[PDB]
């Protein structure tokens, strides 16, 4: 089915598949904030699973491959989402509508300010590029299918389709050929930074875990243990 969709239908499908924006249980210590972030992430994870199943090509994969891809990519996916909805709040991270944190509230947790700064710099970059919603959804699907793919032709064929869709959107927006290729590259290089940020976030989350205090859901612990 995925290989048969048009560019516009790929976009329509991904837009349709988008997960809800969730609220946190907010109403400020190292523990309370982390509880908030991990509580939010756990609930987001459940909606991410439904969304993945709606990314074209993904339900074609074995359950085992679906699990591996999600285990590798879940924090990357949460983070690009966070960056996307923070785009229009310079110097702030919109974890949720009722949880808009600035770089300084990141200092409320050891090691967290550095991660916030990377998240904020990426938001700034999206803003600089005037990243579009259609492009964002494409990039998010690329993360899902790409991050764990080396650890299969079908995945790579689907990936190429999404590249075609990105280029379609850019051509439709009036960009020259040269501009399309440059922008595609700019967009994909951000995925390097998003990988970096997930790696750092994973190590952090892991430290929080061993230190007890902040309780993580069974699901979060399991996703976490797949990276160790």
């Amino acid at each position: 089915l995925a290989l048969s969709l048009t560019a516009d239908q790929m976009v329509s499908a991904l837009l349709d598949a988008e997960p809800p924006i969730l609220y946190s249980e907010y109403d400020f210590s190292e523990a309370s904030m982390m509880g908030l972030l991990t509580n939010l992430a756990d609930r987001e994870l459940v909606h991410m699973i439904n969304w993945a199943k709606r990314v074209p090509g993904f339900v074609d994969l074995t359950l085992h491959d679906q699990v591996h891809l999600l285990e590798c990519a879940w924090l990357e996916i949460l983070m690009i989402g966070l960056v996307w909805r923070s785009m229009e709040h310079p110097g702030k991270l919109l974890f949720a509508p009722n949880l808009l944190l600035d770089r300084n509230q990141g200092k409320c947790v050891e090691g967290m300010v550095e991660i916030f700064d990377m998240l904020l710099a990426t938001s700034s970059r999206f803003r600089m590029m005037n990243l579009q919603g259609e492009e964002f959804v494409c990039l998010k699907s690329i993360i899902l299918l790409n991050s764990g793919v080396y650890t299969k032709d079908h995945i790579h064929r689907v990936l190429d389709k999404i590249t075609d869709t990105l280029i379609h959107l850019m051509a439709k927006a009036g960009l020259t050929l040269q501009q399309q290729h440059q922008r595609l590259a700019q967009l994909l290089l951000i995925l390097s930074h998003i990988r970096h940020m997930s790696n750092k976030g994973m190590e952090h989350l892991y430290s929080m875990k061993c230190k007890n205090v902040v309780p993580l859901s069974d699901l979060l612990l399991e996703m976490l243990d797949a990276h160790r």
């Binding site: 459940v46 699973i49 199943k53 359950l63 679906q66 699990v67 999600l70 285990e71 069974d218 699901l219 399991e222 996703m223």
Partner: peptide, 9 residues
């Protein structure tokens, strides 16, 4: 694993 169950359901 919990992820298994969520994918099927």
């Amino acid at each position: 694993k919990i992820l298994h169950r969520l994918l099927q359901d």
